[PDB]
Amino acid sequence: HHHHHMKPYYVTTAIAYPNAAPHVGHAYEYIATDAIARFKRLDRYDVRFLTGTDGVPTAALARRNSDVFQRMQEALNISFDRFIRTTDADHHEASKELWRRMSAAGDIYLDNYSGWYSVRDERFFVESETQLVDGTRLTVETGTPVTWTEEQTYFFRLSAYTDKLLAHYHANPDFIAPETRRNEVISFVSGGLDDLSISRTSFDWGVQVPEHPDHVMYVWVDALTNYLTGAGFPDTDSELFRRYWPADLHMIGKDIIRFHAVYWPAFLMSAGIELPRRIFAHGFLHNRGIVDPVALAEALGVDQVRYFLLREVPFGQDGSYSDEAIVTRINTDLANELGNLAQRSLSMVAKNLDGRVPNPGEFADADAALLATADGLLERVRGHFDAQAMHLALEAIWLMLGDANKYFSVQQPWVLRKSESEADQARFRTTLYVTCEVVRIAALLIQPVMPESAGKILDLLGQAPNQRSFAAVGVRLTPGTALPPPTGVFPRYQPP
Amino acid sequence: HHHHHMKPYYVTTAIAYPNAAPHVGHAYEYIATDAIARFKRLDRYDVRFLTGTDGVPTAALARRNSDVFQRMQEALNISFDRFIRTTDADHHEASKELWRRMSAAGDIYLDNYSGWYSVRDERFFVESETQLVDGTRLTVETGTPVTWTEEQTYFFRLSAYTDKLLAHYHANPDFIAPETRRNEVISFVSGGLDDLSISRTSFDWGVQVPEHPDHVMYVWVDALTNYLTGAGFPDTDSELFRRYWPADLHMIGKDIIRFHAVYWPAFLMSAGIELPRRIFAHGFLHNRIVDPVALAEALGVDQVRYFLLREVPFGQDGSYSDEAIVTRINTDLANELGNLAQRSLSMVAKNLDGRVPNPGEFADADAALLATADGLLERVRGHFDAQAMHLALEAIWLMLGDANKYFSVQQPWVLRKSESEADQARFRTTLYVTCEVVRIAALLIQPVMPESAGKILDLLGQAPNQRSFAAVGVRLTPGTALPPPTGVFPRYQPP
């Protein structure tokens, strides 16, 4: 009964709230988290990569959510793992069990409350958190209407966890990232926290509170438990839960950080459940002077868009999109620096070395320096990925590709091809081998960012599909390997 | 510059040879040696507990070794000490220095030789040590193929140390254990020894012989020096070597006893290096191969550690069966130890406000049980010093038998019902005595079942700083607050 060997890694994308519809607006988040998951799969991890998502209006919306999810997954090549339907997941047993544990811990109480309530956010707001935009009172943070409501509601004793949360932040400095987001959460919690309304009296459809069917949970309370549902909760003895909980990484947008970094860990502390290891809040994309990567991918190519978004924007910051910025990356970074270097060297293998990887001679100093830089990339890229700094990992790879192109232009293997010498031909073989070998290493490491284009390059280098994990980075290109006739992988931008 | 104050104790598990894979098949060995090391740490020793281990086919095989090691260490809770890698260790300087010393002493010579050679064992074999099994010539001892080779090789003058080895066995009766293994080694050496080939001419990867780069040492010659490397050798003036060499105990399987009890001490005699103090060769397990890692994941790490160290007299071969381990899980652990702790701790919680009672004056029955418990540490220490962990565990559970008998005779559940003044006093005394002997037993079983014993000590309100053997002589403090009792030893759950 051994169906797994590698260390597990459980990573989630964000719940939909405050949007009723999942997936929409999450393409950037999905591309980034997919690259993280693909990197972990290539680095000998058992990856579990899941979404944070689970009358007549509600059901057709379920078809649209499905259609949007399939299109986004296929257009951007997201490799979410397949979740198995269970009876507990259909009946919201996770949030009901979480409620039971928090109630049994003494952290849930009924009370009367009056204040500004937002139907869309399902939250209460204080006076300073509202504003009259134009004779209509809206929330300052989200812009949703509020009306004054006097309700009976169940509260979570969030105030009893202010210091416990600050102690968790101090003991786990990598729990919240990037650092500007960590400083903001610490500043917020340090000001003190009030108790948190978590239910409403309603007969509308929703997750009924255990023992109190006249109350229903707010949508975001039950939504957060989807992370636990993804690991088989409330079946804490199940193999799924022992293996994958706690989650290693919650990937979210910075708009819902307080739900994940304050409310969520307090809920889990109250219920006696292990907390997630890390929360990373990314920024949002805007046009220069909203950005739809699915439409960009269909127009420009999936790997061009995935590369641009993960390279142009330092992950965590807000990003600016201009057509000029992505055209340069498509034409310079991809088509020229990587594509043309691979095409030039592979063309000489096919035409002058009978389509066979040459056996290199003894490596000169210039050969060893370039190989040493490439051999050191896996360690540097792994460190950047562990901090969710994919832009720095891609910059490191293209810095090596810069050295490789410089090396290629200095060695001039296309002029050594002519000479009938014994030393020029040996130098011809060695320089082509070194260029192919560093292209192989770069192609292996860009698989998380551009899976198909990297796969095509590895096909051109005669690498079987079984020899494409990061363990293969330390195994040099085999002389005598037969290479297929080279074809283009990274085309130049074609204006409409 | 005092980073130590206790007497050092250096104990090793065996080198991998003949198998190229370390750790594989050594789980039973690791568990027993870990219990010995844990006992020494609790007994005010500075313990150094190390393994005897250090192209493309060899690199990823090193990844598998690390995976097997970390999984085995975690599944069985083995507490090997952390080895610091140095420049000398990376370049195999210990075996080079050992070879130099033996050569400088005149004990290594080059010679021609012809005979049956096993590339797997890296040893030569005489005709009577080979056999044709089905048209192929194998060693009778290990079943590896041999081919007739006529090679130049370096020899160690083992014949010059036959009598010196016998004199060492006689002067040090505890050097080899158990006694059946000692008798076999003495009989072998008494028959006389030939000189020992220790190198081969090959351009494969290996430890090149100093001053003769065409020869490489046999893998087991270099492997033996890992024991020296663990103590900082060849840096004989290092703090590690002065403090931890000679090794106090080489724990090995009896399959490689001649490498450790004959070749190894003769090497060290030639090199002028102090000999290890003691070598213990344990037996092998079989079903009526046994995989303790798989057993632990299915049954519980402490259930498996206990069964393996109690069921088989250490040094003998053992037979593990499902019924035999179920008996020890349910009787020895869940009932004899578990329910004795649960029934008495539950009475402290419900009847004595979760507070250790202040006992009255001890009756003859109370003092008799306490006396048996107070004498356990000395008896268990003597068994561990002979590596007789089965006898240490038997001595502890014989006391737990007396405690269960004492508990049933006193009937504390009857005394709690009486509003009398005398009965309530006797009720406090018998509960204190029962908790006190459970505390002593839990302290002494820490080397065998670290986690379960820690849980019992948690239920008895013992802080983590008061769990060494120096705390055995400090009675349970009346007034100590106890957490609500929870289960520690579950009964066997059939799948």
Numbering used by the authors:
A (entry chain B): -4 to 49, 63 to 297, 307 to 513
B (entry chain A): -4 to 49, 63 to 296, 307 to 513
Study text:
Methionyl-tRNA synthetase (MetRS) is a member of subclass Ia. MetRS is unique among the essential AARSs because it not only charges methionine to tRNA for elongation of translation, but also charges initiator tRNA to initialize translation. MetRS is considered to be one of the most promising drug targets in combatting bacterial pathogens, including MTB. The catalytic domain of MtMetRS spanning residues 1–115 (the N-terminal segment) and residues 226–292 (the C-terminal segment) has a typical α/β Rossmann fold.
Dh-MtMetRS with a double His tag was used for the crystallization of the apo-form enzyme, whereas N-terminally His-tagged MtMetRS was used for the crystallization of the Met-AMP-bound enzyme. The crystals of F-state MtMetRS diffracted X-rays to 1.9 Å resolution, belonged to space group P1 and contained two copies of MtMetRS in the asymmetric unit. In F-state MtMetRS the entire α2 helix (residues 50–62) connecting β2 and α3 disappeared from the electron-density map, suggesting high flexibility of this region. The KMSKS loop forming the distal end of the AMP pocket was completely missing in the F-state enzyme. Ile10 and Tyr12, which constitute the upper wall of the methionine cavity, push into the methionine pocket (Cα displacements of 2.6 and 5.1 Å) and hence the pocket essentially collapses. Collectively, our crystallographic investigations revealed a previously unobserved active site in F-state MtMetRS which appears to be nonproductive. We illustrate in Figs. 4(a) and 4(b) that while the active site is well ordered in P-state MtMetRS, the methionine pocket collapses and the AMP pocket shrinks significantly in the F-state enzyme. The cavity of the active site has a volume of 2186 Å3 in the presence of Met-AMP; in contrast, it reduced to 360 Å3 in the absence of the ligand. In sharp contrast, we found that F-state MtMetRS is characterized by a completely collapsed methionine pocket, a nonexistent AP and a severely reduced groove for adenosine. The HVGH motif adopting the rare β-turn conformation in the apo structure is not involved in crystal contacts, suggesting that the observed conformation does not result from crystal-packing artifacts. The unusual F-state structure of MtMetRS observed here reflects the intrinsic flexibility of the catalytic core, which is unique among the characterized MetRSs.
